[PDB]
């Protein structure tokens, strides 16, 4: 219902969206464009990394999980710098920067 109506943005529907990708997909189907019970890409993209930074998404020591969160929200610079710090994934982060360049 609230995937069709883009409502109840605060309720993460955790009963059915238990994975991270299920959350991203749940919200990107809820973002809106031009006051209550409404979320926009700017709020969502900022809300995610500002409040729930790397710390929240890298506790499982899985780096790509956070990268996908930033890249699939149009925050390409964040995801590039972030992934560029993983000494094992420097190569990959430089190139995804070149492509964007």
């Amino acid at each position: 219902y609230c995937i069709i109506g883009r409502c109840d943005v605060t309720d993460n529907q955790s009963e059915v969206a238990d994975k991270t990708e299920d959350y991203l997909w749940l919200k990107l189907n809820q973002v809106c464009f031009d006051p209550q019970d409404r979320l926009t890409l700017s709020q969502f993209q900022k809300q995610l990394l500002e409040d729930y930074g790397e710390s929240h998404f890298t506790v499982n020591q899985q780096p790509f999980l956070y990268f996908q969160v930033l890249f699939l929200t149009a925050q390409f610079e964040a995801a590039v710098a972030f992934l560029f710090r993983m000494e094992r994934l420097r190569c990959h982060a430089v190139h995804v920067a070149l492509v964007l360049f």
Partner: peptide, 8 residues
């Protein structure tokens, strides 16, 4: 309260 469990 988003989960941190990656789709595996």
């Amino acid at each position: 309260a988003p989960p941190v469990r990656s789709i595996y």
